[PDB]
Design a protein around this ligand. Structure first.
Ligand SMILES: [Zn+2]
Length: 39
């Protein structure tokens, strides 16, 4: 999961997959559209 420097516990991924743009960290808090990858 990229989503680096941003939440003290949130890290995740979206990318095309039926749901365009989703939780930017399994929740999307203080992220908005930064970036993240899936474990
Ligand atoms: Zn994040």
């Amino acid at each position: 999961e990229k989503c680096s420097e941003h939440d003290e516990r949130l890290k995740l991924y979206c990318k095309d997959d039926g749901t365009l743009s989703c939780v930017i960290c399994r929740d999307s808090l203080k992220h908005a559209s930064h970036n993240f990858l899936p474990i």
